[PDB]
Design a protein around this ligand. Structure first.
Ligand code: NA
Lengths: 514, 519
């Protein structure tokens, strides 16, 4: 979707002051909150935790949270419990009532959040095969006067009416979360998720169930899931398994959702997080799942090349070339005209960014400066390896940002004109062969082999030295890159030297046509 | 208990008018209704049926009832459910079950009343309460049982009734609800450990020790390993043709959360035996927490020395004929024409009574008798004598070889003109005396008007039989003559503190009831 490390949704409490009563408080897409990057996924998300810390109590000040979270119920899919990258769950307080009679506000009930968050969003995934993910899921409901969800939460405290139904409520007493052993057909403890991810076809399906207390089949299914995978993200729908027919509907899971979204985390996407909001705005869900406890394709490139030390770091990215993720904050690259330039301060003081180009849509590259640090960056969404064209002669044209020196330093931005930085590449896909040239003043020569949706080769200053306007002699510099966008219209790469002349360069070119 | 042909309990519907809402409606002992004696036990009880007939509907007017019941005066759909204990299904004397309508909602805003849900009854009723039972042995009875619950806001019983319509909250949970979908009542074959279809009862009656035990279970839908669920065990003492005791909720746990209503014991199990030798029975109870009422019925296997537990007879004057009366093992409760006439509000007594034959006139004796009552009964005009008593257990029959009993008798005799004489304590009026040799199984005595009769007989178990005769000589009012009068009687109360009997004849007639007390 619009990408992020995580999302949280707060419980609602309904005003029941007589004469100024809200009959209902619905959930809204706008209610979703970003969590930010967690240092430790097992801990509560910091922004929302701080909110709850300040929530007033009167008799019980503790924060209660999902049992596997960092402060004897269980909530886990057996064989799939050792999360390292992604956590979902809930936390709350027995919040004091708001009793503001002269402003006509009375509110009572728990206050808290459901959430998921993760670290290390994936840049590679299995190339093929169907893989089973299991884990947990959580929910929070709207509030409506007279409403109860007695099938899921015993309504002695007006859960669903005065404050949201949620999966952490003390009266959620129909799951097996407190039992000591499992029935033969239980998937685990409490509310659990089961997803089948088809990396071959870039899609996934799943089921969200409750494992039922034993006091006849022991689970109940509330949703099935369907989603398309794009890069490290996925988007789709949730289908309510029991909606309204012969029943008056004793639970909140009665409407489909068209807003299922999530993403993969970890080295090869072995964990995932997701959320959705029901179309009738009655229920929000978050969840997490992982491969069983213990060949790849690359879906994106996102790198930072630091000048001062010529070093190259991987950046996080949510499979969106136009969204630059640095230091856990998200910097957009298009203003909701070749190249571009601007600065940005969140909430390092400010970020200065120069980005190219206007004609590129799956690939962005340029300059990044913190304040003072300076780096180049490149990020792109790789084309599916199965979409790599077979054409034997393909020309790409564009530019590049350059920083090089054997004595004094030369720096040159990218440009469309005139004798400024220019790049050209000819690719023989059939041969798995790639070559091209970068010129400043009319010089590097690059040979490489294509592998899947990526390439790898060398860049040399040739013979001998370059200019510095003193000869810089770079030869056998490792060059890595990729093809971005559908059907590989855009391509990009970078190189650092060494692995008395230095060099750091990002470049990107666009495909032509007869 | 207090005896009767049957009992019914109505479903509750909770008021949910906002602002005037009942959060709960509990069941009460006072909610039990007498059914009266059914002409045909397979039919619905008439009083309660009439109530349900008048219950308003708006879309579906049918009365739904237990599958083995007579639809009678009422229809169905998607229907072949069963509710039966296999091998024990051919009831003739006693039926239990339920009947109901999809009642219209009461929508009376102007009286702040909103009520919705089914309206109906559970019940059992029987005919021919037993005057004899097997003398000994343990006997298996099986059958069915039914329940109705209280109503409470937010409450559901999802383990027994799928709560889509707020069963247990807006209207009573009950065993006939359309959403009782977890029993096997609709299945076509039985698992090998099912006792039958739907909710069934299993009782072991120990006639030797005058007690019984039992189990009430559900036979579960097959949707490995066991296919029934037990909700109660039962324990009761038998007294005459009645039994009383307790029900014990099988799963009350402690910690709950209790998805069914059967969570509390009951100290009010009561029922009775029906049929020639008590081969069928009916029972009811109300849970101590007033959350559930149960009724049921059971019978010996579908197709033995007997003991007599009571005598209850009517001797009609005009035709000198003798009919058995129904009785619920209670000497002080006179049951005639299906209605119950109490006999205690001073020797003898007299009074009249009209139920709801115009009125009944009764003269009853005596004040010192507690397991035996006898006197005059008149309908309006018909006239009869009656006697009824609770027999002493044959095993309690004393061995004493010389025992005197003293009392009186009511007399009606004539060879020409008629002589009638009430019973009395004094003076030369009717007086009776008996000497009994239990060891000899021998009994004799005399009735005198002041002239007399003389009775002799032998003793079989807890009853006696023999003959009575005038002096002949003759009698008074002019003389009447009696010879070889057929005499029947019994011993009543613990260790036979009491005894009584009667005779009819058969140009002289005679009809006499008598009762005496031990000295
Ligand atoms: Na009755």
């Amino acid at each position: 979707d619009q990408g992020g490390y995580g999302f949280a949704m707060r419980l609602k409490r309904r005003n029941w002051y007589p004469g100024a009563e809200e009959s209902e408080v619905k959930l809204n897409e706008s209610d979703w909150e970003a969590t930010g990057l967690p240092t430790k996924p097992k801990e509560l998300p910091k922004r929302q935790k701080s909110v709850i810390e300040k929530v007033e109590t009167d008799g019980d000040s503790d924060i209660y949270s999902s049992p596997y979270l960092t402060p004897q119920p269980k909530n886990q899919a057996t064989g799939h419990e050792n999360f390292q990258y992604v956590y979902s769950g809930w936390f709350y307080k027995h919040a004091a009532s708001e009793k503001d009679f002269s402003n006509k506000k009375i509110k009572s009930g728990d206050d808290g959040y459901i959430f998921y968050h993760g670290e290390k969003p994936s840049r590679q995934l299995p190339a093929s095969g169907k893989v089973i993910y299991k884990g947990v899921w959580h929910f929070v409901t709207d509030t409506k006067k007279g409403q109860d969800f007695r099938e899921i939460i015993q309504p002695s405290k007006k859960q669903g009416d005065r404050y949201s139904g949620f999966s952490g409520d003390g009266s959620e007493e129909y799951s097996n979360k407190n039992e000591s052993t499992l029935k033969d057909d239980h998937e685990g403890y409490g509310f659990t998720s089961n997803l089948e991810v088809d990396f071959g076809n870039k899609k996934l399906t799943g089921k969200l169930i409750r494992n039922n207390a034993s006091l006849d089949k022991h689970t109940t299914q509330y949703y099935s899931l369907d989603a398309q995978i794009t890069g490290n993200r996925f988007n789709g729908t949730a289908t309510a398994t029991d909606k309204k027919e012969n029943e008056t509907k004793l639970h909140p899971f009665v409407s489909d959702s068209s807003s299922l979204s999530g993403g993969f985390f970890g080295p090869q996407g072995e964990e995932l997080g997701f959320r959705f909001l029901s179309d009738d705005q009655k229920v929000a869900v978050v969840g997490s799942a992982k491969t069983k406890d213990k060949k790849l394709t690359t879906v994106l490139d996102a790198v930072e090349l630091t000048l001062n030390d010529k070093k190259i770091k991987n950046l996080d990215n949510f499979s969106n070339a136009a969204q630059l993720v640095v230091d856990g904050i998200m910097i957009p690259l298009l203003p909701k005209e070749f190249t571009r330039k601007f600065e940005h301060t969140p909430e390092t003081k400010t970020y200065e960014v120069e980005v190219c180009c206007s004609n590129l849509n799956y690939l962005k590259y340029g300059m990044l400066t913190r304040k003072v640090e300076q780096s180049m960056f490149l990020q792109g969404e790789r084309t599916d390896e199965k979409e790599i064209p077979t054409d034997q002669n393909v020309v790409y044209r564009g530019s590049w940002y350059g920083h090089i020196a054997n004595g004094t330093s030369w720096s040159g931005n990218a440009s469309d004109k005139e004798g400024g930085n220019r790049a050209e590449f000819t690719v023989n896909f059939a041969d798995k062969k790639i070559t091209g040239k970068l010129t400043a003043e009319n010089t590097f020569t690059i040979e490489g082999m294509i592998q899947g949706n990526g390439f790898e080769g060398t860049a040399k200053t040739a013979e001998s030295g370059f200019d510095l306007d003193p000869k810089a002699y770079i030869t056998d510099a490792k060059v890595k890159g990729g093809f971005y966008g559908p059907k590989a219209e855009e391509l990009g790469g970078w190189f650092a030297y060494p692995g008395a002349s230095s060099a750091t360069v990002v470049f990107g070119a666009k495909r032509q046509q007869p």
